[PDB]
Design a protein around this ligand. Structure first.
Ligand SMILES: Cc1ncc(COP(=O)(O)O)c(CN[C@@H](CS)C(=O)O)c1O
Ligand SMILES: Cc1ncc(COP(=O)(O)O)c(CN[C@@H](CS)C(=O)O)c1O
Ligand code: K
Ligand code: K
Lengths: 386, 386
């Protein structure tokens, strides 16, 4: 039984955009405001304040580590999902002619990094079709049919932001591992949608690099994210953007080496109070139940919505079977067009989003979502037709 | 006449750490809290919320542009000073053998980036002594005696964080411009201390690249900063860390190019409410008077402190003439040591900081600082002796 009162934003609106940004819980707002008060009272720049901040950073790094069942050393703190991807990509020792493989469902921001890399190191990239594997086929097999001699890295979203498909990461990892080419194939995972909705254990699940953010499904504030790097891959990633938070210091205050673990990829001054906000949101989710129970709760709500949409004659879900996670994508048979339909809905305080490719509308159902909100969505969607 | 009441943190303490982080003005805390409320009420992810954020970003970009008297197109928004430096350094098309010159008073974080670059592109770097030019000599001349055939970039702090000297930037720029080698010599300026205290007009002052932050002298919240790049140098800087905020989009939502001006160096989701905070702080400073009046106010206070320290027999200021800005560094003749002396002072709610090189203590005087706080500092410093 979810405590909806902890998320005051739920009232007087019908929110289905958790995948864009989660509704901020009261405890998170409180922790943010309290941090500003602490800095004002004790600093903001001083021995006591600087200590309190270092302690806060360590507490967030630890909560994130526990979240994925890994050691604090494998966790880097960033501001969003993308930065984590920039860290891995710019850190690899790319050689002219190396190749990168991406699914055809990756975020335009990520593709932009790859383009920048290709132009800088003369590497090449190409996509492999996974979108079409929502209701049939096998993305792992598709990848196998694309792996080549110079394939060095594969980039994929564990949960696709556009179609709602949960890719078979374990199988894809194996495929990459057994492959034999000029490089051991490594996989960078974009977890923008998976983290905070899917139960994730990186000690029971082999992963090389996993990027995520705290402002979507974890419901933290905009501006705080993180990155996971398996201990065996750390060496392969050279720090790129660095600062006073990336190194260790000498007797005269000079740089003497890299800071321990993932700290070497952290740059400098950040919005610390936001860190306290994410910490509070993380702890609030553990008090609501285990990751597994929250995931099933999410799936019960997504299936309820999915089922409701199947009944609507002019609505067509992309998934022919029950959603594997909280994302439900669909099209609407109407002359208006999806963009105008999302605006009409927002006019009635119903919040969903449009998806560019494929051209559809997407609803996100979280464990705090209830049947009344879903029925209200269904009621309004019912007014559109050909 | 400064309105000290706008900075509630001033009361019940004696703050001299503006150069580390400024005291947050009430109006900034209000704007931060209001932004969280707007996102909760209208989103946080939605058409209305996304529009409000884009408008907020444009307003801050413009206020910063106006601050330095330049075009909005030359301003990039970052999270701190260091990131601006990473953008310029990683963006240049380095060639094996190129050389970088840095003064012997640059931040250890900046030096760390240069070492990372040297190791990646095989470039070399060396320092030129400016610390000793606080009371005599000429840093521009020192630079002239260090310029070489392969010198491509020079890195310097406009206002030195350790000694408090204001380098002759105009002269240094001329020296670099008239030099003839294999490259036109460009200069990256670290303005962590200069921005917000020194009056800066980049349309009257020739500058290639100028990095800064909003949480020190501008008194904004930790986590928001920016970078200036002259329109003629924009083409030389290749975007490195990029994301969905760095590009323009196509018909199917795919990347089609770089976003206009400085936006190409912005990555992805950020702490937007903090942006509103910096905007509010920036506007509060203009209501207090012009940049010139605030600078003179700052200098009157620094000289007052400097003069008071000259009277103390066991205190020795590094500057033999009146400080050129708000930073006042000095040593103390005592067996205790500077670190122990900064801690005792903090125990009395008097806030200063230690400096590693040279080994001294630094006080920062802002236009909101008053004679009573300075006398209280002098009173307490008087108890230390050999
Ligand atoms: C799959 C995916 N990858 C990256 C992002 C970008 O996240 P940051 O801003 O770097 O944290 C996203 C974002 N998704 C939401 C906004 S476009 C959404 O509405 O799905 C991904 O989905
Ligand atoms: C000259 C200089 N350059 C960079 C910084 C780092 O700033 P960010 O954390 O990137 O904003 C600094 C910082 N100075 C303060 C210590 S962190 C200080 O008190 O001097 C510079 O001074
Ligand atoms: K249907
Ligand atoms: K003296």
């Amino acid at each position: 039984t979810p405590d909806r009162h902890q998320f005051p934003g739920l009232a007087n609106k019908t929110y289905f955009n958790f995948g864009g940004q989660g509704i901020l819980p009261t405890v998170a707002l409180e922790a943010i405001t309290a941090m500003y008060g602490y800095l004002q009272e004790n600093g903001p720049f001083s021995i006591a304040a600087n200590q309190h901040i270092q302690q806060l950073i360590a507490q967030l790094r630890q909560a994130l580590a526990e979240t994925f069942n890994v050691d604090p050393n494998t966790i880097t703190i960033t501001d969003n999902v993308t930065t984590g991807c920039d860290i891995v990509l710019w850190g690899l020792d790319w050689h002219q002619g190396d190749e990168i493989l991406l699914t055809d469902c990756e975020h335009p921001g990520i593709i932009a990094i790859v383009q920048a890399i290709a132009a800088r190191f003369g590497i090449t990239y190409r996509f492999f079709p996974v979108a079409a594997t929502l209701n049939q086929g096998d993305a792992a097999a598709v990848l196998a049919n694309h792996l080549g001699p110079k394939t060095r890295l594969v980039i994929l979203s564990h949960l696709l932001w556009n179609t709602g498909q949960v890719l078979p990461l374990a199988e894809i990892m194996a495929v990459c591992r057994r492959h034999q080419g000029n490089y051991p194939v490594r996989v960078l995972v974009d977890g923008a949608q998976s983290a905070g909705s899917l139960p994730l254990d990186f000690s029971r699940l082999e992963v090389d690099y996993y990027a995520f953010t705290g402002h979507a499904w974890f419901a933290g504030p905009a501006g705080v994210g993180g990155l996971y790097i398996h201990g065996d891959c750390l060496g392969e990633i050279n720090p790129t953007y660095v600062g006073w938070r990336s190194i260790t210091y000498g007797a005269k205050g000079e740089p003497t080496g890299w800071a321990e673990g993932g700290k070497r990829f952290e740059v400098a001054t950040s919005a610390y109070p936001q860190y306290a906000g994410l910490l509070a949101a993380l702890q609030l989710h553990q008090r609501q139940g285990t990751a597994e129970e929250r995931y099933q709760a999410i799936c019960q709500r997504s299936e309820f919505l999915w089922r409701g949409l199947n009944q609507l004659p002019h609505v067509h879900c992309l998934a022919t079977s029950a959603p594997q996670a909280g994302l439900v994508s669909f099209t609407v048979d109407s002359p208006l067009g999806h963009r105008a339909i999302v605006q009409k809905l927002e006019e009635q305080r119903i919040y969903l989003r449009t998806i560019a490719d494929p051209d559809c509308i997407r609803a996100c159902c979280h464990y705090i979502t209830d049947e009344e909100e879903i029925n209200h969505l269904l009621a309004r969607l019912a007014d559109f037709g050909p």
